[PDB]
Design a protein around this ligand. Structure first.
Ligand SMILES: *[C@H](/C=C\C/C=C\C/C=C\C/C=C\CCC(=O)O)CC(=O)C/C=C\CC
Length: 259
């Protein structure tokens, strides 16, 4: 029944808004220019240094440390959201953990896209804006790492998905039967099938003019997986090069034994 899928789509959107402090609608209102919302921009070290009075130790390291904190916070948000998804909490506990750790990275890059424009990532809950050029500027090996996210985001943004689309699309990512080491796949695939049905309905209703948006959206996932591979490689280099830099336990658990 179409009505059941609509009810599920709304349930997921409701949890999404509650789970994520900053949404695409808010992000884009801040970026687009819809007075008070408007953020302080960091393009250089003077701007970065100036920021702290405006907004709530090597510089490159300090940015990376910031990004770690942000990722940890995102996982927590995604994890809260994941519980909301019908059936996920009922799955085997080991399976829940497996889904979460593979999902988290893919979901983060997707959610990151909403804050991105070709110039920058919003920061500090949309209080600040950091330039893409400034992030590239950071000394090796650090300067490269943001760029892959920007490339995906620009292509991804062209789809121009609503927050309501995103919420369903990410439940689909979390609920993947393919994940390595899953004890039971059948229960997971049945739930994913339902989410995919909700997404299909949602995309047609929300974007009737767009053609094959469902398929196009599903293909992007290939891209997400690619970003993860590159990120892990980058991350392994960072540890060897900087012995002095700590990695968050939660982040460490997610990244280890991955593919
Ligand atoms: C790094 C995470 C976010 C990139 C955006 C901006 C630069 C990072 C931090 C600046 C400080 C605050 C912004 C965030 C906030 O407070 O809301 C991308 C990433 O996924 C890296 C993951 C692991 C590397 C440790």
């Amino acid at each position: 029944e179409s009505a059941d899928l609509r009810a599920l789509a709304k349930h997921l959107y409701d949890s999404y808004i509650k789970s994520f402090p900053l949404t695409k609608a808010k992000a884009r209102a801040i970026l687009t220019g819809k007075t008070d919302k408007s953020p302080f921009v960091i393009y250089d070290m003077n701007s970065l240094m100036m920021g702290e009075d405006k907004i709530k130790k090597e510089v490159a390291i300090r940015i990376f440390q910031g990004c770690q904190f942000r990722s940890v916070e995102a996982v927590q948000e995604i994890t809260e959201y994941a519980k909301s998804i019908p059936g996920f909490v009922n799955l085997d506990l080991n399976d829940q953990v497996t889904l979460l750790k593979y999902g988290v990275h893919e979901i983060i890059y997707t959610m990151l896209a909403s804050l991105m424009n070709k110039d920058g990532v919003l920061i500090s809950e949309g209080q600040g804006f950091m330039t893409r050029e400034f992030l590239k500027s950071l000394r090796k090996p650090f300067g490269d790492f943001m760029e892959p996210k920007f490339e995906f985001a620009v292509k991804f943004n062209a789809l121009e998905l609503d927050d309501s689309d995103l919420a369903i699309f990410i439940a689909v990512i979390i609920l993947s039967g393919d994940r390595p080491g899953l004890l039971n796949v059948k229960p997971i695939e049945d739930i994913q099938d339902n989410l995919l049905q909700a997404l299909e309905l949602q995309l047609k209703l929300n974007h009737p003019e767009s053609s094959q948006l469902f398929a196009k959206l599903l293909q992007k996932m290939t891209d997400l997986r690619q970003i993860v591979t590159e990120h892990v490689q980058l991350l392994q280099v960072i540890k060897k090069t900087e012995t002095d830099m700590s990695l968050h336990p939660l982040l460490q658990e997610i990244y280890k034994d991955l593919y």
